[PDB]
Amino acid sequence: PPDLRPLVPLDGGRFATSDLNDLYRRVINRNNRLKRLLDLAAPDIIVRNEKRMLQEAVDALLDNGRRGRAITGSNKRPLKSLADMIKGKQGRFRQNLLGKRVDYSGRSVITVGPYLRLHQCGLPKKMALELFKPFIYGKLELRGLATTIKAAKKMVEREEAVVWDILDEVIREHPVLLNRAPTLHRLGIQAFEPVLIEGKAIQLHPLVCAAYNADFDGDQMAVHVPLTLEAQLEARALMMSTNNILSPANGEPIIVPSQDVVLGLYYMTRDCVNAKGEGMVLTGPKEAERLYRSGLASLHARVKVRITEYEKDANGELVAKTSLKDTTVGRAILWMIVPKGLPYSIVNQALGKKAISKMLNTCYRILGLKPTVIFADQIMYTGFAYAARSGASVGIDDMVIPEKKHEIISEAEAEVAEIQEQFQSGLVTAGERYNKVIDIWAAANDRVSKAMMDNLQTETVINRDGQEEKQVSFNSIYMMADSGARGSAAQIRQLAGMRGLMAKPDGSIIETPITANFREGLNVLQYFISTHGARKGLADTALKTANSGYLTRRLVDVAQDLVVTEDDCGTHEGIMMTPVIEGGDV
């Protein structure tokens, strides 16, 4: 059909045409020339050549390039035939049938919203206005404000003081859908109740971006509107963030807290030996919070307080028990957040990442889902507040270098020198020399890493009416690493201690390690070897993302051909599941 053929008047006498136009043109031309040749009774060779040319024209119109000679029409580029409009990632299936562009949609950069609740999110005022124009028009026509659509449109364009309340009312309980650009699992699209904010960015909850795998370094996400009663109810019932707290892959809660809140809570719970108010007595958590905010006492100090915990009985009963515990002021203050069902032993810890994860898991298991959302929200609020009030900061003096690192490095160089001497003596060959050097350097790196760890742990002595009470280290980098917030053991080892061994192009290990660290100056050749080893891993993901997308597409194409259509099959065959114990213990 003609209008389906791309042909539009461009600027001036030229028109933007399509390749199918030229295809049909040439086909009609060759057909007319063949008819003319047949009418004049052309020689057999002439009519056979014309028939061959017409066949070439028609089977290039069908599928150009399949015959072998990809003819071009303009710009010396391969021509687009009918088969090209269906195959590939640009055919109708991949571009205009499976994934189509939708209306009532928007796109904007993400931004941390730390005040909004887990079930809601932020939305720019102009974005919300441009998205819900029909709802605003309907609500204006409802009230005695706009009699027609033109008046409502003019008022929206002018954006008078009488339209903002309408926009607040239409988004009172109308959720929207937030979506990340690369979508991996069900959590790639979630539902959220929007609250209007003055700005051009989308404020997002911190505890869900982790499931989104969306960092705040400039990521842009999309927003969509349900537009239908059925759609709004489904988004509130199924796609809502509260209804998606367990990952569909593993039963682990996907709302595990992030680095900032867990660091705040670890600082709140990491008790010292001596501080302001060590050894006093407090009535309840409220009095502890009062004494802390008054400044008359510290945040972490061993204090005997009285807790009033609740235990769920066999039935739906919550038995109350009041008992005197000896805990830190931070745990007592945080106790005002946890619901009544949980015991006190879950707070009387250092409250690391795994600790808070298992706490949230136990809360969801015992108390269900309804209170778990508000529990996590209060957790995040208190964590942010107390991490801001704490003042966690990494500095040059915070990263300490082991004083005995130099002697270990000198012993290692003496060992490699005597190994080289043995090699020059003709006793040991090159392969065994390389192996010995590699294992000696690995042992030296392990020793220096253990030294760095035991150093970062010590030199924390505080006198509590005594002489020395060496405790857990309070170094900020150690607080960030040990709590599992952001830093790991290998990362802090590469940071403070020596980097260790690196790799060459083929994959082997170079015999000359990096005997320096990041805090200390790094040598030129050492940094060169380091960046050579790191570029491999950097390009790794950049190449592998395409293969991963292709694998996901193949897997979903194999999938989606089955649903749960029966309640029971009525069989007895299965599989003999047993814990695999191959290799190690299990």
């Binding site: 389906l4 001036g12 009918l82 409009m85 499976l98 562009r101 939708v102 209306d103 949609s105 928007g106 796109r107 950069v109 931004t111 730390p114 029909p134 028009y137 309907g138 659509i149 690369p182 979508t183 699992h185 700005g199 051009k200 960015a201 911190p206 705040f216 370094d217 400039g218 999309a222 349900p226 537009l227 759609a231 199924l238 680095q259 900032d260 809140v261 660091l263 945040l299 009030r389 003042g391 966690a392 900061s393 990494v394 500095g395 003096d397 960030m480 940071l495 000359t512 100056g521 790094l522 030129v524 060169f528 380091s530 960046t531 050579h532 080893g533 570029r535 950097l538 390009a539 190449l543």
Partner: protein
């Protein structure tokens, strides 16, 4: 001694390595390339003479008519670069070649040619690069990146592993010429050797070897050795050397001279070889069953019967043995076969060779090349002789021949462009040897095997590509040309070569408009090496080998500067001190190291010569007299770091910056950062947007003092002189007497460019930084361009930054900012957008740019002028008609009387269509400039007249300053000459001599001198009038736009965009983030002194992403600011210059044994105050890439001021007003606003347009379109429930032609119920499949 701009504000520097090689010209690569391109070079070297002397001369088909080439010349560019930019024409130059047609009569092959026609002809124009290495094709400044490809020559690849799944390593030799047909020898899974020509059919190598008049015996003598068997009395003795039987077992009793040597079944060991060499015996006794395993070498003919006994490559059988013995041949030559030394490979190729003679060999190779068309022998030999031994279809360049001779271990390095039989023989021998085990493969992972080509080489290649077409044309036209019928001008057309050059410079995989947003991006884009484009790989088909960086990349290409994403490793940046070799390789400078002293000389080593010598450590602790403080030293022999002695070393690194790029050397404390963070920071620094007011970066690297001057961004001083006239638009300098030319000289004028649109919609503006009467030196900076400060690069801004969580507003990577930053006009930038309206010549009458816009009021037309264009400076925020474009729709011949009537009386103007261009809905700002171009012939509007009059007035002001200076000089001269008549001079020549030069007395000399001076005066006046008239004719000359257009108008809308939550900001260590929420000044934390902090980052981002150097930098900046504060306390409180000088000396004399060693007593005691005033904002600190200041140096610099040594200061909360425990660190960090502003990212659509091919909503931000519901989104949705949600998102909201309107009507009527309908695109697919020969149909 220091430069004047250094005396303005000298930057404190650290480091203890005194560099010996200064920073070379950052853009020297492309500049030298284009210089080699356009210049008269003898001996047909690189540039333009090579292609000419290769193609020219041309002879007709034995017609005694040759076309000779003499030379070429480049005319003056018809437009200055500023004119090309303000117009849109190319900054090109003509190419006038002086050719020579020599045609002679018939009946004389070598008859002396007469009637020679020597004529100059113009053949297209070539674009010339500016002084910054940029080409202007169509207004924009397009740059050509250099391409890294395979070096022409030979390579040996090793196919292993999954190759053929046979567990057999194969070795393939590849001969690749610079321009011509390829060649590939390879092996089968068996021991068979084959050869192919440009991926053709796999055929054995014996046929292509014998094609060059080669017989079997010749091939066998060349490849394999000869074993001699003698027909003795019995047993057929043979000659032996104890080295040929090494590694084989004795199948017989090897005994000679009546003494047993090796028993039957004993492997000949090394001791056996020594024993058999001690006696020096050659002839032994060998049995009969042993010769049957060998094979004869040459064909032995019989003399009794005259027949062949046995041919070559045929195993010998006892009957053949008896026949050859009875024939009489005593000496029989056989092959020496041994799997460890000479693996039998040519024998298999010979026994699988279907052809024997050269005739059938040539015809088979012709059939293999061209399918069908079986010619005779002389017709088929033409192809084989033209495709591999003709200088027109095989163009092995000088570097190709050099690499070919070096790979084959040959002394001479010169040769021809064509191949040779001995070269093929040698490469086949080398492949056989590398198969046998001798010799190793050359990996494609080597800069010695990868050749770099600049803009000049590809320009010459495209010139030759066009010249071959022009040559074919002139040859087919020379078939008719005879004597006395044509000049050597009509036979040459400019179309092919000019068009080829234009398309190569305008549209190619390498021609791209430069990212004009900061000098750093310019420098890193001109020093950009790509692997894509013609002759290079594709990012889609690149393996893990090209992406990885090699130890041979040391100092030749930066390993940390690479665009992360689709092309990691394919696009790199050249090293700092890297140079282009004459052959086209990457050379790195090294200091020669003698036995004890390291002399201060430099040698530019190549990539191949690296493994021969050893390179010393760059930052190795060295002693005086070129000595090392330690006997052992870190070195590298062949891409492997190791420990050597102080005397075995032979070369040292020239500096410590040659490893990192120019874009990476600006990263302070780079040694304390990880590779990933460093790469991300170096990539993000390229996208820095120039702020409204630049400011010196505190923690600098010293290199910034070069990138700002080596580029063409700032105003450089061509001649050092005294400042005469300072203005925001122009700067006029008076040249000093020495630097001034002894004749026709004057003063220099630099026309500063004002706010104009760049290639990235950014503002580019130069600001003067000099004062009147201030003397300047040659090369010094006069006006700071965009993002510069006193000849120093300044991309972002320095800010007071703390590292502590703040209520989660720095949750993961978000940035917190105070209102003080946005209030102080800190990060506010300017964006300039160009909007064009064209008056195309269509039928029914041409378009008009009048102001008579009907169907609209005056409010929408109030911003329009009398001509029909928006005023210069008229703001606009929404869709508003800013140009009155109208087009006729019906009848032409609207009488001008009726036109003016309609303008005053009557009805509206009918045929207008209201097609005027308005600004898109969403963009705001105030228009700052309007350009207009009228084709020669159309009536120029009065606005065009005003614009050209203003530019003429500017040019005339410049010319008037020039002429008035010259005239004042000439009048001083006339005053000096008429001193003899002094009384009349002083009485009637004070006021009126400026117009009454007419005088006369004492002819003999006075008349002569007065006439000479009047002649000089009138000649100067006439020359300046000619200059003014030429400038007027140039600026008034209408430029061509397009076939079928009247005039093109452009408007530049400039908008001031401030920082807001949503923008992207990053430091210099890869700590990117988005502004979370602007905070009030009271809410932000503040120190115990009262100074509020500006930025509050997240300290949690430091451990995982290992960029710790940034923290160091921060501390350093703190220290710097502290120094500045001291200076402020010294400036506000009026202090004597002595205390200030002493403090500055103590600051610059920090105890780190630095190489700066600046003194304050050498200053003029006046510029010290200006320097201190320039220091009150902080103390600029330089820091080498690897020789940066240590921790103790920063600690002592901090303790110099009253700042705490720990670097962490107690902070007070802005909200609660209490003390933050655990003292947070705080300092001054240099940050950058990325080119990812939110105002160009936020976008939404309720209901807009739809595509014409299918009724689907558009997207994007330029057009009012929504977003795309990707296939992964559909998968995620169907993984949930939401069946109705997907069903509405697919057709109701996007595709249903009759469903979306119904849904909108229901929603506006308060009805939230839908109708499924049918997706339109589904019907489109139905119709498309129905258009094919396939029938699809829906059932009931």
């Amino acid at each position: 001694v220091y430069s004047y701009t250094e005396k303005k504000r000298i930057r404190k520097d650290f480091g203890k390595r005194p560099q010996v090689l200064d920073v070379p010209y950052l853009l020297s690569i492309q500049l030298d390339s284009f210089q080699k391109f356009i210049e008269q070079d003898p001996e047909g070297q690189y540039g333009l003479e090579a292609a000419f002397r290769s193609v020219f001369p041309i002879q007709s088909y034995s017609g005694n008519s040759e076309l000779q080439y003499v030379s070429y010349r480049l005319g003056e560019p018809v437009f200055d670069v500023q004119e090309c930019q303000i117009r849109g024409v190319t900054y090109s130059a003509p190419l006038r070649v002086k050719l020579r047609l020599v045609i002679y009569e018939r009946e004389a092959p070598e008859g002396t040619v007469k009637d020679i026609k020597e004529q100059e002809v113009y053949m297209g124009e070539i674009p010339l690069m500016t002084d910054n290495g940029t080409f202007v094709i169509n207004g924009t400044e397009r740059v050509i990146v250099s391409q890294l490809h395979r070096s022409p020559g030979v390579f040996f690849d090793s196919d292993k592993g999954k190759t053929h799944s046979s567990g057999k390593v194969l070795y393939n030799a590849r001969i690749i010429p610079y321009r011509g047909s390829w060649l590939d020898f390879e092996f089968d899974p068996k021991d068979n050797l084959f050869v192919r020509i440009d991926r053709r059919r796999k055929l054995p190598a014996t046929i292509i070897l014998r094609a060059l008049n080669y017989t079997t015996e010749q091939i066998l003598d060349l490849f394999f050795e000869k074993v001699i068997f003698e027909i003795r009395d019995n047993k057929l003795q043979m000659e032996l050397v104890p080295e040929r039987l090494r590694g084989e077992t004795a199948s017989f009793d090897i005994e000679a001279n009546g003494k047993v040597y090796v028993e039957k079944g004993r492997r000949i060991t090394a001791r056996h070889i020594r024993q058999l060499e001690k006696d020096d015996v050659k002839l032994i006794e060998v049995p009969v069953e042993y010769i049957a395993g060998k094979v004869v070498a040459k064909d032995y003919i019989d003399e009794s019967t005259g027949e062949l006994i046995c041919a070559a490559n045929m195993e010998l059988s006892l009957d053949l043995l008896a026949k050859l013995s009875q024939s009489g041949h005593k000496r029989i030559e056989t092959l020496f076969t041994n799997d460890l030394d000479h693996g039998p490979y040519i024998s298999e190729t010979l026994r699988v060779d279907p052809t024997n003679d050269r005739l059938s060999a040539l015809v088979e190779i012709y059939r293999m090349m061209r399918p069908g068309e079986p010619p005779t022998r002389e017709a088929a030999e033409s192809l084989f002789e033209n495709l591999f031994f003709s200088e027109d279809r095989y163009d092995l360049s000088a570097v190709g021949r050099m690499k070919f001779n070096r790979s084959l271990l040959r002394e001479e390095i010169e040769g021809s462009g064509i191949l040779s039989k001995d070269d093929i023989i040698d490469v086949m021998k080398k492949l056989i040897d590398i198969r046998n085990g001798k010799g190793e493969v050359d990996d494609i992972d080597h800069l010695g095997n990868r050749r770099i080509r600049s803009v000049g080489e590809m320009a010459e290649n495209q010139f030759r590509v066009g010249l071959v077409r022009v040559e074919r044309a002139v040859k087919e036209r020379l078939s008719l040309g005879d004597l006395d019928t044509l000049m050597p001008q009509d036979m040459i057309n400019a179309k092919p070569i000019s068009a080829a050059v234009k398309e190569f410079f305008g549209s190619s995989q390498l021609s791209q408009f430069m990212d004009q947003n900061n000098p750093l991006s310019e420098i890193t884009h001109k020093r950009r090496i790509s692997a894509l484009g013609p002759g290079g790989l594709t990012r889609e088909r690149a393996g893990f080998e090209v992406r990885d960086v090699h130890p041979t990349h040391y100092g030749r290409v930066c390993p940390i500067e690479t665009p992360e994403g689709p092309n990691i490793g394919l696009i790199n940046s050249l090293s700092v001190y890297a140079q282009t070799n004459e052959y086209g390789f990457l050379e790195t400078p090294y200091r020669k190291v003698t036995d004890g002293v390291v002399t201060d000389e430099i040698h530019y080593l190549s990539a191949i010569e690296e493994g021969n010598y050893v390179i010393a450590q760059a930052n190795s602790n060295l002693d005086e007299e070129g000595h090392f403080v330690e006997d052992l030293v870190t070195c590298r022999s062949k891409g492997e770091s190791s420990l050597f002695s102080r005397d075995q070393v032979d070369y040292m690194d020239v500096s410590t910056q040659q490893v990192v790029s120019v874009g990476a050397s600006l990263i302070p404390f780079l040694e304390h950062d990880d590779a990933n963070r460093a790469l991300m920071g170096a990539n993000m620094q390229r996208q820095a947007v120039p702020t409204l007011r630049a400011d010196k970066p505190l923690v600098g690297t010293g290199m910034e003092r070069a990138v700002a001057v080596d580029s063409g961004v700032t105003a450089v001083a061509k001649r050092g002189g005294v400042v005469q006239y300072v203005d925001a638009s122009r700067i006029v300098i008076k040249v000093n007497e020495d630097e001034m030319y002894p004749g026709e000289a004057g003063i220099d004028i630099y026309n500063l460019t004002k706010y104009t649109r760049s290639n990235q919609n950014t503002c580019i503006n130069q600001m003067p930084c000099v004062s009147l009467g201030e003397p300047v030196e040659r090369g010094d900076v006069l006006a700071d361009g965009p993002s510069t400060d006193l000849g120093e690069l300044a991309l972002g801004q320095n800010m007071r930054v703390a590292f502590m969580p703040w209520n989660g507003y720095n949750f993961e990577d978000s940035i917190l900012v105070s209102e003080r930053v946005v209030q102080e006009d800190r990060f506010t930038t300017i964006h300039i957008q160009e909007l064009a309206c064209v008056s195309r010549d269509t039928k029914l009458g041409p378009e008009e740019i009048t102001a008579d816009i009907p169907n609209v009021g005056e409010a929408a037309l109030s911003k329009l002028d009398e001509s029909g264009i928006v005023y210069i400076g008229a703001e606009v925020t929404g869709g508003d008609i800013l140009v009155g474009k109208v087009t006729p729709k019906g009848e032409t011949q609207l009488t001008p009387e009726e036109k003016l009537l309609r303008a005053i009386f009557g009805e509206k103007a009918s045929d207008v269509k209201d097609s005027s261009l308005r600004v898109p809905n969403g963009v705001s700002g105030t228009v700052i400039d309007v350009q207009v171009f009228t084709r020669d012939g159309v009536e120029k509007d009065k606005r065009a007249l005003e614009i050209e009059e203003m530019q003429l007035k500017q040019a005339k002001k410049d010319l008037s300053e020039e002429l008035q200076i010259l005239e004042a000089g000439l009048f001083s001269r006339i005053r000096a000459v008429l001193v003899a008549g002094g009384v009349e001079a002083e009485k009637l020549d004070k006021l009126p001599r400026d117009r009454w030069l007419e005088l006369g007395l004492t002819d003999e000399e006075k008349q002569n001198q007065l006439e000479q001076l009047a002649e000089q005066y009138d000649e100067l006046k006439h020359e300046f009038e000619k200059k003014l008239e030429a400038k007027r004719r140039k600026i008034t000359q209408g430029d061509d736009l397009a076939p079928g257009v009247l005039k093109i108008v452009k408007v530049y809308l400039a908008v001031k965009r401030r920082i807001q939550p949503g923008d992207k900001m990053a430091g210099r260590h890869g700590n990117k983030g988005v502004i979370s929420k602007i905070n009030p000044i009271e809410d932000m934390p503040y120190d115990e002194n009262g100074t509020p902090v500006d930025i509050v980052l997240n300290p949690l981002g430091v451990p995982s992403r290992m960029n710790i150097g940034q923290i160091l930098e921060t501390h350093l900046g703190m220290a710097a600011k502290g120094i500045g504060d001291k200076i402020n306390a010294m400036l506000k409180q009026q202090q004597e210059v002595a205390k200030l000088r002493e403090f500055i000396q103590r600051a610059y004399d920090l105890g780190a044994d630095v190489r700066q060693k600046v003194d304050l007593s050498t200053f003029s005691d006046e510029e010290v105050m200006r320097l201190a005033e320039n220091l009150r904002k902080g103390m600029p600190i330089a820091t080498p890439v690897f020789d940066g200041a240590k921790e103790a140096e920063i600690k002592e610099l901090l303790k110099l001021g009253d700042l705490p040594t720990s670097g962490q200061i107690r902070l007070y909360d802005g909200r609660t007003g209490e003390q933050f425990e655990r003292p947070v660190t705080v300092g001054y960090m240099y940050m950058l606003k990325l080119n990812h502003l939110v105002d160009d990212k936020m976008h939404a659509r309720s209901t807009g347009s739809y595509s014409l091919v299918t009724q689907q909503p558009l997207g994007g931000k330029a057009q009012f379109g929504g977003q795309r519901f990707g296939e992964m989104e559909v998968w995620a949705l169907e993984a949930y429930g939401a069946a109705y949600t997907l069903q509405e998102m697919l057709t109701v909201k996007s595709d249903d032609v009759n469903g979306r309107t119904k849904m909108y009507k229901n929603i506006v009527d308060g009805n939230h119920q839908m109708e499924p309908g049918m997706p339109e695109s589904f019907n489109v697919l139905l119709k498309e499949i129905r258009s094919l020969g396939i029938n699809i149909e829906l059932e009931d």
